[PDB]
C-alpha cells in the first residue's frame, strides 16, 4: 500500500516587452545610453501665422510668430530582490559528491529565477510608467468635446 506524488507543476512567467504591446504605438522609443548625465531637455517650436487682408478700414495684425518651449521629465524605477546568503555561498564551491552537485544546481536555478523576477518587474515598471504618464495628460471627454 502506497501514496503517490502524481503530479508536479510550476507556473511559467511570460516575458512582457514594451515594444510588443499595442500601447507602444503612442510613443517614440529612443535608446539613450547615459541618461543620468542629461540635466534638462528642451524642444523649441517656431510657428508663423498668416492673416487675410480686408477691405474695411480695420487695423491690421502684423506678421505673427510664436515660440513654444517644452521640457523633459525624468522617472526613476527600482525593485528589491532578496537572496539567502547560503545560496550565494554554496554557489562558489565545487561539488564534491553528487548530492552536493544536486544542491548546487538547485541553488543556481533558484538565484537565476530570483533575477528573472527582477528583470520582469522592471519591465512591468517601464510599461506602467508610460501608461501613467499618458493618464496624467488626458483631460476628460466632456471638457475636450466643446473645446475641439
Amino acid at each position: 500500500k502506497f501514496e503517490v506524488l502524481l503530479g508536479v507543476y510550476t507556473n511559467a512567467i511570460q516575458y512582457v516587452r514594451f515594444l510588443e504591446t499595442a500601447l507602444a504605438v503612442s510613443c517614440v522609443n529612443t535608446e539613450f545610453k547615459d541618461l543620468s548625465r542629461m540635466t534638462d531637455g528642451k524642444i523649441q517650436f517656431r510657428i508663423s501665422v498668416p492673416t487675410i487682408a480686408h477691405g474695411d478700414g480695420r487695423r491690421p495684425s502684423k506678421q505673427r510668430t510664436f515660440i513654444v518651449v517644452k521640457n523633459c521629465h525624468k522617472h526613476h524605477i527600482s525593485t528589491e530582490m532578496e537572496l539567502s546568503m547560503l545560496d550565494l555561498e554554496i554557489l562558489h564551491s565545487i561539488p564534491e559528491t553528487p548530492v552536493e552537485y544536486a544542491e548546487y544546481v538547485g541553488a543556481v536555478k533558484t538565484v537565476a529565477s530570483a533575477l528573472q523576477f527582477g528583470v520582469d518587474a522592471l519591465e512591468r515598471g517601464l510599461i506602467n510608467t508610460v501608461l501613467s504618464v499618458k493618464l496624467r495628460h488626458a483631460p476628460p471627454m466632456f471638457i475636450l468635446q466643446t473645446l475641439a
Partner: protein
C-alpha cells in the same frame, strides 16, 4: 450550427507501475508519477533548464 460532431480519444491513457516504482512501493510505500521523467530531469542532465 451544422457540426453535430467532435473528435476525441478512443482509449484511456494507461499508467502502470513499473519496476523502478515497484521497488519504492515495496520498500518505502510511495510511488512517484512516471519515475522516468524525474530521472531524466535530475540524474541524466545537469541543468536542462525548464
Amino acid at each position: 450550427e451544422a457540426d453535430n460532431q467532435i473528435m476525441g480519444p478512443s482509449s484511456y491513457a494507461s499508467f502502470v507501475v513499473r519496476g523502478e516504482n515497484l521497488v519504492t512501493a515495496v520498500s518505502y510505500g510511495r510511488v512517484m508519477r512516471t519515475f522516468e521523467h524525474f530521472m531524466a530531469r535530475i540524474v541524466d542532465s545537469p541543468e536542462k533548464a525548464g
